[PDB]
From Swiss-Prot, chains A, B, C, D:
Subcellular location: Cytoplasm, Cytosol
Recorded GO CC terms: cytoplasm; cytosol; extracellular exosome
InterPro entries reported in the protein's UniProt record: Thiolase, Thiolase-like, Thiolase_AS, Thiolase_C, Thiolase_CS, Thiolase_N
Name of the protein in its database record: Acetyl-CoA acetyltransferase, cytosolic
Site (Increases nucleophilicity of active site Cys): 350
Catalytic reaction(s) noted: 2 acetyl-CoA = acetoacetyl-CoA + CoA
């Protein structure tokens, strides 16, 4: 307000496929990569950062405070506090909102906010301290257990997605159409070089030495409805299923970051920002339909901004499932030509902790590239939440 | 400022011993217990909570967003956003600072902040996705890996404690004296009923049915220097060791919570708060001496409050190791009769995610009970950080 | 025949309770203990042993050829071949029959035969070579998996025991009576010192140094029908159950051994043997009723010996379940005062690989102590087999 | 003697590569395949089998008595006893010797003897019964632990192989030459169809349905010394190494079986056997040089047969390591044109429990195919043993 918080820089790694191009790279090295890069791009010295805040969901086995590791690995001094927040899929966006708060209230001057996740590296879990006298014991998958299973209904996110498909009447055919659209938009954007600016290469040691990874791995080029309609429903196999692997996102690795400060601090430094942050909201809804979280979230953020929905030029609405993104667009009555125009997570992938910031990074570069003005990033969150941010291009 | 953020209520579970009285209780049930109770005590209806923020470090195997589970298990509606932060030992206090920020900036009206940890339930970890063709594979202890091992030097917190012992010249004899003091102060406080008010019983099913757990489990009554001086150093066994199990805290389970709102909202509701929050700080230091984090943290918080150190009536300085707490007190020149007067974590235990808020809960009730005015809660943090808060009794 | 194979010496360790007195002792050290001891007792130099043959069922994690380890640990040279056989519960007796064959045919001159098992040390199992992309994986209990589960019907031995109880009409009351009898006979034998001769102490390091273990651990003195009839059926909980923990044996650790050679070699050496081996049999039956294996086994061995059943003075019939031992005795019409007179495995325990030889050791010492002449050792075997041996006291 | 034991039939599966063509096939199904087939070939009804004896080393996770499972899966009745022996690498040959003994002494009339191993399916091991309060725990590889590690010196078989290389002066160049020879002989035999008769196809379900596997998988066609001499020593990397993957065998899956009875029983049935068994030996040597076990073993078997070494037309000497097979041939002064003429385990692979019988199967078919008369099968055994058999073609 008058001196709003602005985003000066924004970058992401490619999104790697499960057990794919980024699987050997610890999550904190993904974090370091984007942290170092956004500072570079903003021309901000690492010692001028007030704090680092990252979303990060599946942190088992990553060592003590992996954000701090990521921060220091980027060349930020030990003097700079660094910490993580978890709000499942919303975690990466929540990190940025939290920065908005510390800067707005006058506690931080410059913040590197973001999200990070290496799901390929998520371990299996065993409780061994008591000691099992006799009987089988599970090695539980932390991804499933901590990432993808609703704690209230003990069901996969994909089941909640079927609830939304049912209730918002998004057919199998609808979902496959959204999926094809998402895949084709991503392929068009890739070929047109639309992601080049936002991507920062990741360094990976191979048997044939060091390599740069700089193409998103998860897209399935040549996606078509005929192929997709042959697949069987994955979560719900009693003949009422609609969600398949083709119309859902995946398990993925990646990180993203943004540099934030006040407009006045940007002016003082001779920086022109990507955008100003106008508003944001977090809301709660029923776990059984967590997918529709962004509906109340968007309506509140947009309202808080003094906007009507028509005023929004571009939406990024996390595409965890076609069933959910379709339902959100249908209920709000959004123009699909304004929503996920470079494609969404069905094509690009969904590294839980990173996605909130990743879609923001994309949003901001899309707005910039198209010379459009007003954007909304939003995500549904397991357990029944939604988060949304309003940004306006300077 | 003019309308400061106040703490209306504050409560904790007992602290359970490793694999002890609370080990069968999932961490989110510990959270629910304290959340429900602080609302009860503040007379605030659960549907009036703007959000829930909890510190939580070892979240592997706890399911999707265990704070949200804890929130809902306390009777807070699905409409109320709930999420976690991780800043190792500082996590529980960081949760409260974050609430201060959301309330200060006008985003939240009422917040339940806190921390929670069941270390007994922390699993072992195995990476099984690639597949090991031939050879041994570790089942890594998440407590050690993610909780207690410095990521920069690959050494136990207890090793960093020896660095501080060495550098601040805190002898074995000094450490054992601090340990005895801590144990005796805790035993005196227990017998005098000083913890009765702050403790909320935990419900536990046993073979002989339901029981209430309401005594802290970890204290070793009759602690004496003669016994302690017989023990061997645990981390550093080359004849230069000082830290033993008797002069370090433990692995422990527990939770704690506070209810926060603006002074004006408290006045409107006819509530008298425990205290107002005057200031807080987070700082970074070298990982090798993470223990001395609270020195810069305290100095900055106290300075920001407009106080001198003499102005502080009561300190709670987390007693992870006698070596560290002694070093902090020595360097700042604090009166030991003002520091951890009900005893500290050597006697009480250290459930990582909970401790930041737990010491705050104790602080506030001590200030209340003694009719003293100004308090400081502070903790060192693995990886090289410190966090401190200033509170003033209304 | 004319120059029959004789048993010169026979010894056993105590039988340890699951996770009890012998759990820290590797199975091969149990083997070494009994091997060394029987050589000592027979006055046979270790370098005169032709070969060592031991039954051993649960060998996972025991290292390369644990019989060979056991042999060498007893002071038998590297020049002496040593190897194991597996025939589940019959394994320890099968080892002795196999020795009878190598000596009878003229391939071996002196053989140490026996059985050994540390079930406390049996590991859990995980298949990790492929690599599990996503999902839970079992840590399977090798005891259950490889020891106690019928491979044909995928059911616990205790289920097959219920089949025999049903079909041979052995009531819950019958089973509990057999159990009390077994417990009381064992307690009487212990107090009378009847096991003193056959037991060889095991050496175990404790925190208070080295100790000798020389009392069987599993017996429940003061066993009574009133207590037993209060227990619930363990395997079959649909209201048709009869088998409980009180009328079944346990999971147990132990070893036993015997020294064998021809009568002529014994005469040459100035040794008087415990007994001569007269006959033995191995038979197959249906897995669903594996418990009744000893019926055809005994009938064939006794027939091969030229005996009638009345001619047998003493039987040892492995008491895996009261339901099975009762059924065997009922069908064959045996005098219960001739069967398991020092008690059986319900009281003493059942270390799978050892039991076949353990009951033989006991048989031989009982025959000796009572001055009786003709004995039968027999066991049922998981998967549907029976094994029996006839011995005659010289 | 006068009525010697004869082998009527002999068959093997292909040998599968680690995690290769047979990895999804449980070991007992490999057993059933060869058991059923040898009965078929001998024209012996399954109900006429007196007993089944198989070598089997890595039995963890295979269920109760996997030989019995294998027997019944081949259509052998429940009435036929079936059991396993373990003598590490010698296990498959020991099974046959044991049959010789039961038939020779008049206890069995017809025996199916053999060996079987699925090393791909060998699990990792964890001891979980006590309960680990705090710290890392190993998931131990049962292959390494129970199969490939000398229990006396705690070193890989490959280390003992280096001891033999050193002591018998078998150079790196020598070993690579033996390896190339073995690979080229196997490739020549394959192309000439020499294994066709002995191989029995294994049935495997694939995504594209059922398939027959009938080519040995492990051979590396086009093996050459130039390639081999580029490899680095695998076990001993201090610059004194000679053993590499190219001049050692592998980890492999397979089974083999033979049908045995007396010559008189063969005559009565109108069967002409492959060969008569003339003699066999088992011996012990120092674990550090277990590889040279076959030297004393062969000398004793050949001596017991009334043969000189020149009398042996064909040897099969298990080729665990070129270093060992070379050393055996050098010391005994054998013609390399008489030794492993279809190639050995360097090319064919080494499924521990199966190999003893596998080389016997090959021996017998080679003797038959070449119209040669006298053969020797022999193997070294971990822990310091050797086993050898003499056969003579009828």
């Amino acid at each position: 307000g008058s001196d709003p918080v602005v985003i000066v820089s924004a970058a992401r790694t490619i999104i790697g496929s499960f057990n794919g191009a980024l699987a050997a790279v610890p999550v904190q090295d993904l974090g370091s990569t984007v942290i170092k890069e956004v500072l570079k791009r903003a021309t901000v010295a690492p010692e001028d950062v007030s704090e680092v805040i990252f979303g990060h969901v599946l942190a088992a086995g990553c060592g003590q405070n992996p954000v701090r590791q990521a921060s220091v690995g980027a060349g930020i001094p030990y003097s700079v506090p660094a910490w993580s927040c978890q709000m499942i899929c919303g975690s990466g966006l929540k990190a940025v909102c939290l920065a908005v708060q510390s800067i707005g209230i006058g506690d931080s001057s410059i913040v590197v906010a973001g999200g990070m996740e290496n799901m390929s590296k998520a371990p299996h879990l065993a409780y061994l301290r008591t000691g099992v006298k006799i009987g089988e014991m599970p090695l539980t998958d932390s991804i499933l257990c901590d990432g993808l299973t609703d704690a209230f209904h003990n069901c996969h996110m994909g089941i909640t997605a079927e609830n939304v498909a049912k209730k918002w009447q998004v057919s199998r055919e609808d979902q496959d159409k959204v999926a094809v659209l998402s895949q084709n938009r991503t392929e068009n954007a890739q070929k047109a070089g639309h992601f080049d600016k936002e991507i920062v290469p990741v360094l990976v040691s191979t048997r044939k030495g060091l390599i740069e990874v700089k193409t998103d791995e998860f897209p399935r080029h040549g996606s078509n409805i005929e192929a997709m309609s042959k697949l069987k429903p994955y979560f719900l196999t009693d003949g009422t299923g609609t969600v398949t692997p083709a119309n859902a996102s995946g398990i993925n690795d990646g990180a993203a970051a943004v540099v934030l400060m006040k407009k006045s601090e940007a002016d003082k430094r001779g920086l022109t920002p990507l955008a100003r942050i106008v508003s944001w909201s977090q809301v709660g809804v029923e776990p059984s339909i967590m997918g529709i979280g962004p509906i109340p979230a968007i309506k509140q953020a947009v309202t808080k901004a003094g906007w009507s929905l028509e005023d929004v030029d571009i939406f990024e609405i996390n595409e965890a499932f076609a069933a959910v993104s379709a339902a959100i667009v249908k209920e709000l009555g959004l123009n699909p030509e304004k929503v996920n125009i470079e494609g969404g997570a069905i094509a690009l992938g969904h590294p839980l902790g990173a996605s909130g910031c990743r879609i923001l990074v994309t949003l901001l570069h899309t707005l910039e590239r198209m010379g459009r003005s007003r954007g909304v990033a939003a995500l549904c969150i397991g357990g029944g939440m939604g988060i949304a941010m309003c940004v306006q291009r300077e």
